[model samples]
Target: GTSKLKYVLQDARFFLIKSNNHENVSLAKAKGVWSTLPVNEKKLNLAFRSARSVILIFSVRESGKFQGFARLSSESHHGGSPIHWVLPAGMSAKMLGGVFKIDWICRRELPFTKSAHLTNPWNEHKPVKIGRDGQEIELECGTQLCLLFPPDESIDLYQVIHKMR
Candidate 1:
């Protein structure tokens, strides 16, 4: 007698990363003090370990009105190391700091009529360690936020491209 087993397909999870610095967004990457903060470091590392792609959204200092969206490369830094990303050639942006590699899947300026907005995930303030202050401070990294989507929900990449176009 033979036994039959079935396999199920698991859809990859995509994360929405809110960035205040336009420089990183324009360069297709994020790094430095902001990237390594405790407020978002662990979650960002989780996304890397899970092999999930991230959608980079440019925001102005916690403002919900997101400007541009870019699907970033799967490559990410683990632990306390600063995360970095690379931009393809022909894109007009210079690498100011140490260089890390990344690939740009797709990017477009969001239209005013169809801007991307996300609700605040955390109700209370979270604690984070700051190198400058040399102490753990109960503060929110308003500039950097990472939002994870539910596992069951689907975000069609093709549809995103179509809408952007």
Candidate 2:
């Protein structure tokens, strides 16, 4: 588990390749590093050091918007082998081809109207183009997927409260 996560974070030579577009060889080029970053480094390190199965968070985005999210960890009850994946619920069989870029915006998607109720505009849950799989060229398929941002009301409320304290 430690080694697998380590490989992914520091040594994994993987990048996000475009799914179906033949002209574009890859959707995301590796910056000589893993395409994703750890959302919480301290928690991840502790889990690795203790041999505890831990969840690592990585987001996928395009053009400064949130596309999807994936988690990396050891398979449950399957030994400490590495298993990196995006869940099918938020993930899709089509989109599973592959993706390596994420750019979720910190602000809400919708702009406030003068008299209308304020809402998160990115709520539309639009589909965006993620890259292809390890075999996009061979399979001739790319992962067309959806991404959305809803107000994370509960946690967000608490976050603001603690910050004010």
Candidate 3:
């Protein structure tokens, strides 16, 4: 009954990003919006160019929990547009950074899983740190790391609603 399960998990390129609660909420409200993600320009361009489809997972900053995810548009590399913040405008600037066009978004938050619990086919089990304190300075700039779904974990892409134009 699960032959296609592994195939569904494979093929597409998966990347992870960390975000605070505020950003997470805004993304959920905005449904399908674009943002300037603090990621390596070169690497991001390469991922877009090579991958069949790129899926970005959003993890909460404080608790390290997986909050949500979005599929990035392959054509986003041309340039980034202004983000659509959900109502009550005049929010703090600290919550904003980086750029990436969100093609599809999911409002559902997933369970928490440490880096050790996940798998990275490209870099082995080494955790890809996003902040400056974790690893290299280059990564701190917001580069998304390639990741794979854990053997015991499952994510249904069908749950991803709201496709952005």
If ranked by lDDT, best first, what sequence of candidates would result?
3, 1, 2
Error of 2 at 156 (Å): 30
Better of 1 and 2 by TM-score: 1
List where candidate 1 sits over 4 angstroms from the true fold.
Answer: 1-10, 29-36, 62-67, 71-101, 115-165
How many steric clashes does model 1 contain? 0
Q: TM-score winner among the candidates?
A: 3
lDDT of 1 by residue, 41-119 (tens): 4454455455333333344333433433333343434344444433334432232222223333323333322322322
- Name the better of 2 and 3 by TM-score: 3
lDDT of 3 by residue, 7-107 (tens): 33344555565454566546643656444333443445566576545556666567555555456664443334545444234545434444556544344
Per lDDT, the best of the predicted structures is 3
For residue 91, what is the lDDT in candidate 2? Answer: 44
lDDT of each: 0.32, 0.24, 0.44
C-alpha RMSD for every candidate: 12.9, 17.0, 7.5
The C-alpha stretches of model 3 lying farther than 4 A from their native spots are 1-9, 28-31, 37-39, 77-81, 84-98, 113-116, 121-165
Residue-level lDDT of model 2, residues 12-52, one tens digit each, is 11122222221121222111111222222233334334432
Clashes of 3: 9
Ranking by TM-score: 3, 1, 2
RMSD of 3: 7.5
